[PDB]
Structure 1
Amino acid sequence: AFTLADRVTEEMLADKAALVVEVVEENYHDAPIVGIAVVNEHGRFFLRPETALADPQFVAWLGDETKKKSMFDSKRAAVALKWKGIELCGVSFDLLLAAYLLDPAQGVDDVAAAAKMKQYEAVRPDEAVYGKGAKRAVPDEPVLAEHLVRKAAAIWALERPFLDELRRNEQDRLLVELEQPLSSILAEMEFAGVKVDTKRLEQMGEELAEQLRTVEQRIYELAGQEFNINSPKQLGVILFEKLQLPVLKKTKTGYSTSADVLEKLAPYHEIVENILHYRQLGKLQSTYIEGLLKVVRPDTKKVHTIFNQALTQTGRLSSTEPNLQNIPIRLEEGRKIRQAFVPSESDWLIFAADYSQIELRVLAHIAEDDNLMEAFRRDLDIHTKTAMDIFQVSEDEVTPNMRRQAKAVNFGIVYGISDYGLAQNLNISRKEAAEFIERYFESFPGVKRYMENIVQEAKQKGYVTTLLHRRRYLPDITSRNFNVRSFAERMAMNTPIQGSAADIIKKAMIDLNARLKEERLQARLLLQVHDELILEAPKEEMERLCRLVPEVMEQAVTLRVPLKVDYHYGSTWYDAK
């Protein structure tokens, strides 16, 4: 039972409560709050938001850091409230982040899924209540109120068991000192948004519609026929049946036309280079011009991403609607998209700071590999040094092709090395790749010992860990299926590296936000892209940021090798290079 309240009472404002501030729309930016539930020592309450959020005592309670709240996905509530000019403080327990740290593979995305981890089933999945996709809707008040009170009651009854298990895992500080403070910082970043130069985007797309038409007509002429270049089935028929190009592959999905296949097919027909170019331009038009403009707010011309903090299996963030972690940079034609990402105020600039080789520096630290540690203590070009070691040549004798192949070896080492995977990447034989790998481990025997030991540890304990005690369970490590077991072995090798790098930049974000506040700088974090942080600030703060941001990022943790941070700034994101 619970109270369907018509007005806020003092009983509802106790100094510890489970709080539900329900936002049903997936994108919570400027979205409605459909209902509120409070569970505390005095009872269970459902409040209508138009009543509660207009009540000064309830708003003061929400903003009082000394009034502690337990929630699920507090960032969603905090951001929805920010759009209403209401501050949420005092969130001491977030069940979504607790569940994520205990086991990221559960895919916990609602209270019911977290509750099932502790045999609590007296709450419905959100999808059962609201529906999926187009059939989605807020139910009538009796159904909605019971659901919100059941979620608040579940949070109330799950905080202790979840904290107990986090404690046993030595993850309690990871929740309270890393993920929960980070959630508030991410909320600020998403709410600030990034300003988009939409007229430049519209022009850029224009440059693109003309070039697409040009290459599309060239492809039709070369194919001797007009067809749907973007259809995988149709392209494969044109290439491999009409034009009779060679098929170097498997499976029975018609034919693969991925860029790695087309790059090998290019010497056989002029059409292949044009299809690759058409693919590049069409990706920019559909995803990064048209798709971006769809989610720009028409009034402010800002995009407000949502950073999913409880999704990836390694501890990284992800970014949605739009994804601001995969904006084009590698080819110049795509890189120009970043000219459309601009500071949100006049006379401000974009400032970008990135870790240099954080994953291999983490590997040097965790493996305690003498040669790799010394390479970073000398601040060597790690791919040139790896080439020197594996091909047994002096620095002057490293050719560009040697550095390229050594770089691919380094990628494989971080991903979880295999002769098959390296051979596929470098387009060489498994035996040739195995020789590269053997040479690598002769030069980096500590890395070899580390990789052997971490796979054995994953088998023994059932999971692997990161520097700050994030965990990933790997039950497939004991599979008698070669493919299944090999997947788990690569995850055992990769997750402590990628995940520790994620831990470090998350701590850097917390440290940076604190330093920006101490210095009373106007600079603000806008984005994180795995190993880099993107800020905007007044032009008059650039000199201070050039010293502050790299130092904070470099000092976030202390490893057996230095951390190194590069930085750039300019008038647009493109120019911060």
Structure 2
Amino acid sequence: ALEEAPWPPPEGAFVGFVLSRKEPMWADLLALAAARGGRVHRAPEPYKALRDLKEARGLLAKDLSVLALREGLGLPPGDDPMLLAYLLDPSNTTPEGVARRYGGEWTEEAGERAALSERLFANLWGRLEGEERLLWLYREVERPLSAVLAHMEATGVRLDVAYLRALSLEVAEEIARLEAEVFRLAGHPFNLNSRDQLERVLFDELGLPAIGKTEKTGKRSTSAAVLEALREAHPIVEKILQYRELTKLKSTYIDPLPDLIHPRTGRLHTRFNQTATATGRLSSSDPNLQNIPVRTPLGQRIRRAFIAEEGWLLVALDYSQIELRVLAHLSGDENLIRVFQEGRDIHTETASWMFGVPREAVDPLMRRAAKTINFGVLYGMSAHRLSQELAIPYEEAQAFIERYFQSFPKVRAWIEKTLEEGRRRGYVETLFGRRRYVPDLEARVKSVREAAERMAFNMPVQGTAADLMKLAMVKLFPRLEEMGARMLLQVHDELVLEAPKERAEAVARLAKEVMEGVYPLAVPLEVEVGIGEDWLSAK
């Protein structure tokens, strides 16, 4: 029930391929095949074979499409059963799993993969039968978006290598001064990178009171938060906090990034994973460029390393208070929609409160602090943690939480409805109908249940913002190609583009408009836009 034919596969066939490694940009195409009707075609010389295809249909189409772009081809990605599955159940994140759940085994033979892609698409496509809403998301968002992600990955972003190279030597020296002090304070050297060794030193050798425990092993935590609480109990704590910062940045960004520069491009190429999140957001792997530093001074110094090619400019666009505007539209809370209809900003307002300064005195750093608070409280943070963090009394934190929700009466009602329906149906959905199954909504253990609920009511808000960003990327991409501009990165509610200096303004202008008008809501969407030679200056 599956014969073999000479390479030349008929049009519309599903491809199957094997890579030396999972990164499309660094991978060696080991094998390539195709499956159609009831037979399979294997290419004797894979690279040569790529030229024959007109489209990539099958598991991980975008990835082969990326490698294709890397070789000068324009093979756009088409149907991909992974996208259908992801839409049926966001827990379908890997081929291994999707193949086992929907009909087969993910092997290492290209032929078998092409055959697998075909039968999988057939079964999954049959399951979406009637799911008009998921069908809309597939054809109007996911499938086209895959093409967008391909170009983004293949294009990559420029990095100032010698800059980070020198930054490394500089920080290494500061790390040395910090570890050296810590050791003097402890009275003896030990591996500071080891949480276990630091536990003993802090809680046994020194007489510092433990503040909390780790989740799976119950050890006394040495988290930055636990360290905050002990900042004044001993001189060694501040030191460890700075060591933690520097080494985190150094080992995670400063040193690894310069070594990931592809030779044929001289740019960094990240993976944009389309089926890896339970809410519908994307993620970046290998170089995960969705978590590049930005808070601290050294963090900012690192972001300054992402630069535009000579003669071009980076254009950074970011939705304003994105998830709050979504909540207003989902909850229907008129007081909250009025906030936006009146051009207000909850982050600036919370910041004003936090630091005891008039709005107009809040800086971007203070406002950034307030966002974690606003979203922390919205999504479930406890009075206890809130009081701890802000460093205020329990009652003062308990009051803020009360006022917050009392101020937007409809939000809690919406939350409550999202859960009831979630309990009955077994899943929750976004504005466009993206679904996430949350069975634990009925666990008989409060601990597990309430955690399940927090995950449950957050999905529609985070997911909807995701649908929006993806939709916008799909509408924006073609407009950019015609203007000679390129899309480089996506950071959940942010886009980083690269445009020739003579068009950077028109591009910024166009992107902003495209994004703000993506899908009109009961509240306007505002996009902040910036232009500059490096990512930091862009925003």
Question: What's the TM-score once normalised by structure 2's chain length?
Answer: 0.91
Of 375, 383, 391, 1:411 maps to 375
- Output the amino acid matched with 2:407: S
Question: Tell me, what secondary structure is at the counterpart of 2:29?
Answer: coil
Question: Tell me, what secondary structure is at the counterpart of 1:245?
Answer: coil
Shift in CA distance, 455/426, structure 1 to aligned 2, threshold 3 Å: farther
Question: Tell me, what secondary structure is at the counterpart of 2:48?
Answer: coil
Q: Which runs of 5+ in 2 are unaligned?
A: none
Of 437, 445, 449, 2:409 maps to 445
What residue in structure 1 maps to residue 39 of structure 2?
44
Of 236, 239, 242, 2:205 maps to 242
Shift of 1:198: 0.8
Shift of 1:363: 0.5
Shift of 1:523: 1.4
CA contact (8 A) 1:417 1:490 kept: no
* Structure 1 residues 288-307: aligned runs within 5 Å: 288-307=253-272
Name the CA distance, whole Å, in 2 between partners of 1:397 and 1:299.
48
Of 2, 9, 19, 2:15 maps to 19
Question: Tell me, what secondary structure is at the counterpart of 2:404?
Answer: helix
CA contact (8 A) 1:23 1:76 kept: no
What residue in structure 1 maps to residue 105 of structure 2?
124
Name the CA distance, whole Å, in 1 between partners of 2:326 and 2:121.
39
Shift of 1:546: 3.0
Shift of 1:224: 1.6
What residue in structure 2 maps to residue 35 of structure 1?
31
Of 477, 481, 490, 2:454 maps to 490
Name the CA distance, whole Å, in 2 between partners of 1:269 and 1:195.
43
What residue in structure 2 maps to residue 351 of structure 1?
315
Shift of 1:384: 5.0
Shift in CA distance, 297/7, structure 1 to aligned 2, threshold 3 Å: closer
Of 103, 108, 115, 2:89 maps to 103
> Are 1:456 and 2:448 counterparts?
no
Of 137, 143, 146, 1:174 maps to 137
Question: Tell me, what secondary structure is at the counterpart of 1:316?
Answer: coil
> Are 1:76 and 2:63 counterparts?
yes
What residue in structure 2 maps to residue 543 of structure 1?
505
Deviations 1:227-276 (A, max 9, x none): 21111111111222222122222355442111001111111111111111
What residue in structure 1 maps to residue 471 of structure 2?
507
| Structure with larger Rg | 1
Name the CA distance, whole Å, in 2 between partners of 1:412 and 1:221.
38
CA contact (8 A) 2:340 2:523 kept: yes
Name the CA distance, whole Å, in 2 between partners of 1:202 and 1:81.
31
Name the CA distance, whole Å, in 1 between partners of 2:469 and 2:479.
15
CA contact (8 A) 1:39 1:156 kept: no
> Are 1:113 and 2:97 counterparts?
yes
Name the CA distance, whole Å, in 2 between partners of 1:272 and 1:436.
30
Shift of 1:292: 1.3
Name the CA distance, whole Å, in 1 between partners of 2:351 and 2:170.
41
Of 146, 151, 158, 1:195 maps to 158
Name the CA distance, whole Å, in 2 between partners of 1:350 and 1:74.
28
Question: Tell me, what secondary structure is at the counterpart of 2:507?
Answer: helix
Shift in CA distance, 162/70, structure 1 to aligned 2, threshold 3 Å: farther
Shift of 1:328: 0.6
Shift of 1:413: 4.3
* Length, aligned pairs only: 534
Name the CA distance, whole Å, in 2 between partners of 1:149 and 1:508.
32
What residue in structure 2 maps to residue 88 of structure 1?
75
What residue in structure 2 maps to residue 268 of structure 1?
233
> Are 1:63 and 2:50 counterparts?
no
Name the CA distance, whole Å, in 1 between partners of 2:278 and 2:7.
43
Shift in CA distance, 224/409, structure 1 to aligned 2, threshold 3 Å: closer
Shift in CA distance, 169/212, structure 1 to aligned 2, threshold 3 Å: same
Question: Tell me, what secondary structure is at the counterpart of 1:574?
Answer: helix
Name the CA distance, whole Å, in 1 between partners of 2:189 and 2:410.
57
Name the CA distance, whole Å, in 2 between partners of 1:187 and 1:300.
15
Shift of 1:510: 1.0
Shift in CA distance, 418/235, structure 1 to aligned 2, threshold 3 Å: closer
> Are 1:480 and 2:444 counterparts?
yes
Shift of 1:505: 0.8
Question: Tell me, what secondary structure is at the counterpart of 1:575?
Answer: helix
Of 196, 205, 216, 2:168 maps to 205
Name the CA distance, whole Å, in 2 between partners of 1:387 and 1:332.
20
CA contact (8 A) 2:77 2:146 kept: no
Shift in CA distance, 515/156, structure 1 to aligned 2, threshold 3 Å: closer
Q: Which runs of 5+ in 1 are unaligned?
A: 130-143
What residue in structure 2 maps to residue 468 of structure 1?
432
CA contact (8 A) 2:319 2:525 kept: yes
Of 528, 534, 546, 2:490 maps to 528
* Structure 1 residues 373-388: aligned runs within 5 Å: 373-383=337-347, 385=349
Of 267, 282, 302, 1:317 maps to 282
Shift of 1:340: 1.7
Question: Tell me, what secondary structure is at the counterpart of 2:226?
Answer: helix
Deviations 1:460-515 (A, max 9, x none): 22111112211011111011101110111111221111111111111111111122
What residue in structure 2 maps to residue 54 of structure 1?
48
Question: Tell me, what secondary structure is at the counterpart of 1:233?
Answer: helix
Question: Tell me, what secondary structure is at the counterpart of 1:312?
Answer: coil
- Output the amino acid matched with 1:124: E
Shift in CA distance, 394/229, structure 1 to aligned 2, threshold 3 Å: closer
Shift of 1:183: 0.5
Shift in CA distance, 308/147, structure 1 to aligned 2, threshold 3 Å: same
- Output the amino acid matched with 1:456: E
Name the CA distance, whole Å, in 2 between partners of 1:410 and 1:496.
17
Name the CA distance, whole Å, in 1 between partners of 2:420 and 2:396.
27
Name the CA distance, whole Å, in 2 between partners of 1:23 and 1:290.
27
How many percent identity over aligned positions?
Answer: 43
What residue in structure 2 maps to residue 141 of structure 1?
none
What residue in structure 2 maps to residue 559 of structure 1?
521
Shift of 1:419: 4.5
Name the CA distance, whole Å, in 2 between partners of 1:159 and 1:280.
46
Shift of 1:426: 4.4
Shift of 1:527: 0.2
CA contact (8 A) 1:189 1:525 kept: yes
- Output the amino acid matched with 2:54: G
Name the CA distance, whole Å, in 1 between partners of 2:391 and 2:420.
30
Shift in CA distance, 571/394, structure 1 to aligned 2, threshold 3 Å: closer
Of 364, 380, 400, 2:328 maps to 364
What residue in structure 2 maps to residue 136 of structure 1?
none
Name the CA distance, whole Å, in 2 between partners of 1:71 and 1:429.
57
- Output the amino acid matched with 1:213: A
Shift of 1:85: 2.3
CA contact (8 A) 1:22 1:35 kept: yes
Name the CA distance, whole Å, in 1 between partners of 2:359 and 2:110.
72
Shift of 1:187: 0.3
CA contact (8 A) 2:32 2:111 kept: no
